[PDB]
Enzyme design. Structure first.
Site, mmCIF file in Angstrom:
data_model
loop_
_atom_site.group_PDB
_atom_site.id
_atom_site.type_symbol
_atom_site.label_atom_id
_atom_site.label_comp_id
_atom_site.label_asym_id
_atom_site.label_seq_id
_atom_site.Cartn_x
_atom_site.Cartn_y
_atom_site.Cartn_z
ATOM 1 N N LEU A 9 43.311 42.831 48.448
ATOM 2 C CA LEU A 9 43.502 41.590 49.185
ATOM 3 C C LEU A 9 42.535 40.512 48.716
ATOM 4 O O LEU A 9 42.903 39.351 48.561
ATOM 5 C CB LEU A 9 43.298 41.827 50.681
ATOM 6 C CG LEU A 9 44.449 42.434 51.473
ATOM 7 C CD1 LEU A 9 43.999 42.739 52.883
ATOM 8 C CD2 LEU A 9 45.630 41.495 51.481
ATOM 9 N N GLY A 10 41.289 40.920 48.508
ATOM 10 C CA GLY A 10 40.228 40.029 48.088
ATOM 11 C C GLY A 10 39.309 40.735 47.119
ATOM 12 O O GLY A 10 39.236 41.960 47.108
ATOM 13 N N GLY A 12 35.653 40.130 44.224
ATOM 14 C CA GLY A 12 34.386 39.473 43.974
ATOM 15 C C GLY A 12 33.249 39.938 44.862
ATOM 16 O O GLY A 12 33.443 40.713 45.794
ATOM 17 N N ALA A 13 32.054 39.443 44.561
ATOM 18 C CA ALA A 13 30.833 39.835 45.251
ATOM 19 C C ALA A 13 30.565 41.327 45.099
ATOM 20 O O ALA A 13 30.723 41.884 44.015
ATOM 21 C CB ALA A 13 30.910 39.455 46.715
ATOM 22 N N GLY A 15 32.171 43.980 46.386
ATOM 23 C CA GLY A 15 33.384 44.753 46.174
ATOM 24 C C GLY A 15 34.662 44.044 46.581
ATOM 25 O O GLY A 15 34.627 43.078 47.337
ATOM 26 N N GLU A 16 35.795 44.529 46.082
ATOM 27 C CA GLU A 16 37.083 43.969 46.447
ATOM 28 C C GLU A 16 37.467 44.401 47.856
ATOM 29 O O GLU A 16 37.083 45.471 48.311
ATOM 30 C CB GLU A 16 38.162 44.406 45.458
ATOM 31 C CG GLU A 16 38.541 45.869 45.562
ATOM 32 C CD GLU A 16 37.545 46.780 44.885
ATOM 33 O OE1 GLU A 16 36.506 46.280 44.412
ATOM 34 O OE2 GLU A 16 37.808 47.997 44.819
ATOM 35 N N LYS A 32 36.654 46.746 53.242
ATOM 36 C CA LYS A 32 35.747 46.049 52.352
ATOM 37 C C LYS A 32 34.876 47.093 51.684
ATOM 38 O O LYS A 32 34.226 47.884 52.361
ATOM 39 C CB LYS A 32 34.879 45.088 53.163
ATOM 40 C CG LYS A 32 34.218 43.976 52.375
ATOM 41 C CD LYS A 32 32.909 43.571 53.033
ATOM 42 C CE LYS A 32 32.486 42.169 52.654
ATOM 43 N NZ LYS A 32 33.101 41.157 53.551
ATOM 44 N N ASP A 114 28.285 30.093 55.983
ATOM 45 C CA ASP A 114 29.196 29.880 54.858
ATOM 46 C C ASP A 114 30.615 29.539 55.305
ATOM 47 O O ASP A 114 31.577 30.129 54.830
ATOM 48 C CB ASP A 114 29.187 31.083 53.908
ATOM 49 C CG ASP A 114 29.654 30.728 52.494
ATOM 50 O OD1 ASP A 114 30.286 31.585 51.830
ATOM 51 O OD2 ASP A 114 29.386 29.593 52.043
#
Ligand code: ZYR
Length: 254
Positions: A9-10, A12-13, A15-16, A32, A114
Site C-alpha cells: 500500500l505504501g 519508503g522510510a 518499511g513498506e 507497517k 508532519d
C-alpha cells in the site's frame, strides 16, 4: 499467521506498508513493517482513540509489525487535482475532520509534526484519518507544556518559527501545516518551497500579493482564513478554537 499480505500500500522510510487480509474473518487491515523512534510511535499509538485518527489495533515483533486501520480511500493527496484543487465543499468537510483530529491530539498533549496530504487517509465513506505518528511527540504532560526544539516535518508544510527559533510551541506549528493543507486543497499547488525570507513566494505572501498564484485561485472567504493561519508570528497566529468561529469554516456549502 492468519493474515496474508495481499499487496503493498505504501513504501519508503523504515518499511513498506502492506494490506493484510485475514483468510478467516476476511477483515482487512494495514501492516507497517519496520526493520531496525519506532518505540515512541507504538507508545503514542497506544494512547490514541478517535474516528479521525488511523486506528491502532496492536503490534507484534517477529523487525516490528504494526497493525493499523485500513483506509480503502487512499490518501487525500490523490483527491487534489494539480493546479485545480477540489470542490470547495469537499475541502471544507475534509478540513473540519482534520480539525477534529487535531483538536483531539492536542487535547491529549500530542503533536503530529508532519501534517500533509500524504498523511491524511480516507476510509470507505471518505472520512479523513490522521496517519503516521513516527514523528509525533508529547508537548504536554502532567498539564505541563514543553516547547519543541528538534526540526521535524516537510519543508513546504513547515511553519516559519521552526526554521528561525531554537525553541517553539507545538500547537501553532500544526495549525500552520493545516493552513498549507487547506491551500493545497483549494488551489492544487503549494505556495512555497519553505517559509523563509530567502524565498520569493513566501516574501510575496507576507507582502500581501494575493493576486499571484495560488491565492488568486482561492475564494475570498477561505483566503481570509488563510490570512489568519499563515501568520508568521506564532503568537499572532489564529488558534483552533478561533478557527472554529471563522466565517468560511461555518459557511454552508453546495
Ligand atoms: O490504509 C492505510 N492504513 C494505515 N496506514 C496506511 S499508509 C497507506 C495507507 C494506509 C493506504 C493508502 C496507501 C498508504
Amino acid at each position: 499467521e492468519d493474515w496474508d499480505l495481499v499487496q503493498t500500500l505504501g513504501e519508503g522510510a523504515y518499511g513498506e506498508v502492506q494490506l493484510a487480509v485475514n483468510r478467516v474473518t476476511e477483515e482487512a487491515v494495514a501492516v507497517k513493517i519496520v526493520d531496525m523512534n519506532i518505540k515512541k510511535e507504538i507508545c503514542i499509538n497506544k494512547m490514541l482513540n478517535h474516528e479521525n485518527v488511523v486506528k491502532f489495533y496492536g503490534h507484534r515483533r517477529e523487525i516490528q509489525y504494526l497493525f493499523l486501520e485500513y483506509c480503502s480511500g487512499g490518501e487525500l493527496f490523490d483527491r487534489i487535482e494539480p493546479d485545480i484543487g477540489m470542490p470547495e465543499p469537499d475541502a471544507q468537510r475534509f478540513f473540519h475532520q482534520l480539525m477534529a483530529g487535531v483538536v483531539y491530539l492536542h487535547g491529549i498533549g500530542i503533536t503530529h509534526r508532519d501534517i500533509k496530504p500524504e498523511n491524511l487517509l480516507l476510509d470507505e465513506r471518505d472520512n479523513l484519518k490522521i496517519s503516521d505518528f513516527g514523528l509525533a511527540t508529547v508537548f504536554r504532560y502532567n498539564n505541563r507544556e514543553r516547547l519543541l526544539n528538534k526540526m521535524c516535518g516537510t519543508l513546504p508544510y513547515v511553519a516559519p518559527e521552526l526554521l528561525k527559533r531554537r525553541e517553539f510551541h507545538a500547537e501553532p506549528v500544526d495549525v500552520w501545516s493545516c493552513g498549507i493543507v487547506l491551500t493545497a486543497m483549494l488551489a492544487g499547488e503549494l505556495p512555497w518551497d519553505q517559509p523563509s525570507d530567502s524565498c520569493q513566494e513566501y516574501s510575496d505572501w507576507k507582502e500581501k500579493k494575493t493576486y499571484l498564484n495560488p491565492w488568486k485561485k482561492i475564494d475570498s472567504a477561505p483566503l481570509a482564513l488563510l490570512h489568519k493561519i499563515l501568520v508568521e508570528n506564532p503568537s499572532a497566529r489564529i488558534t483552533i478554537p478561533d478557527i472554529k468561529k471563522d466565517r468560511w469554516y461555518n459557511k454552508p456549502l453546495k
